Amino acid sequence: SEVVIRRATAADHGDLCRVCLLTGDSGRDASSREDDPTLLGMIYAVPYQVGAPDFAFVLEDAEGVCGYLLGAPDTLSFQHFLEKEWLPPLRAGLTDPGPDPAAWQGSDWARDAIHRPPALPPIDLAAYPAHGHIDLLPRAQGRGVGSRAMDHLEAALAAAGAPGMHLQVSPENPRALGFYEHRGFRELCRSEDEVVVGRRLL
Numbered sequence: 001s002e003v004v005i006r007r008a009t010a011a012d013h014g015d016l017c018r019v020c021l022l023t024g025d026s027g028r029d030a031s032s033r034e035d036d037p038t039l040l041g042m043i044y045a046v047p048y049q050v051g052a053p054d055f056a057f058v059l060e061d062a063e064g065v066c067g068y069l070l071g072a073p074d075t076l077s078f079q080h081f082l083e084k085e086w087l088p089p090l091r092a093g094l095t096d097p098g099p100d101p102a103a104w105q106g107s108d109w110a111r112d113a114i115h116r117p118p119a120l121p122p123i124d125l126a127a128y129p130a131h132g133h134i135d136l137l138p139r140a141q142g143r144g145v146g147s148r149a150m151d152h153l154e155a156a157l158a159a160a161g162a163p164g165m166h167l168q169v170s171p172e173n174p175r176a177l178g179f180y181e182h183r184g185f186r187e188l189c190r191s192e193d194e195v196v197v198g199r200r201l202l
């Protein structure tokens, strides 16, 4: 049952994508919903390791990678990386299912997100410049591993000078919402599609 936090490497990309897929439907398995099992992790997980390698970690137990913990200390910096170094190769040759959500199937929402990324959420980026994401496989859930992992990431971002961080959570993931509330994160904004929570770090 022992889980350690280890620095992530490019050798972990495959496992990042797997964990991303297995938790990408508001925290639950999205495999049945996506037609491309890699897009999710290529949009939401892999670029953290490539663009912010000093704040990317995996959780690993005897069976192998059982989660990840990924951060970026500065939203503007990381968007530069996405806009100039990640989204362009991702777009090359990439089918565009059109901007109308009504015709989309499977991973089409993800293709559109790549061609036309969403605006950043309506929050105070000076107060909460850092951000991150955590996802544990069920085998590593329910026993404080998320708590220890969030301690690690909050500390790493604080050590980099970040005064606050925000995280995006699905409104249909009330477990994660309750998890963050319990850690002293407050709700910064809420739409029918997304909740953003934040905490000051210094």
Ligand SMILES: CC(=O)SCCNC(=O)CCNC(=O)[C@H](O)C(C)(C)COP(=O)(O)OP(=O)(O)OC[C@H]1O[C@@H](n2cnc3c(N)ncnc32)[C@H](O)[C@@H]1OP(=O)(O)O
Binding pocket: 023, 026, 027, 028, 132, 133, 134, 135, 136, 137, 140, 141, 142, 143, 144, 145, 146, 147, 167, 168, 169, 170, 173, 174, 175, 176, 177, 178, 179, 182
């Ligand atoms: C910002 C994002 O990354 S959103 C996506 C989050 N990822 C997911 O939902 C993927 C699937 N689930 C997970 O990865 C994990 O379940 C996490 C990260 C959400 C939580 O990590 P876990 O290790 O499972 O937390 P655990 O359930 O053990 O609870 C840890 C603490 O929070 C408390 N807590 C946890 N969930 C809740 C809750 N839903 N409501 C109130 N308190 C809660 C627990 O009682 C415990 O309290 P304690 O430290 O005082 O004893």
Ligand SMILES: [Cl-]
Binding pocket: 025, 026, 027, 168, 169, 170, 173, 176
């Ligand atoms: Cl979520």
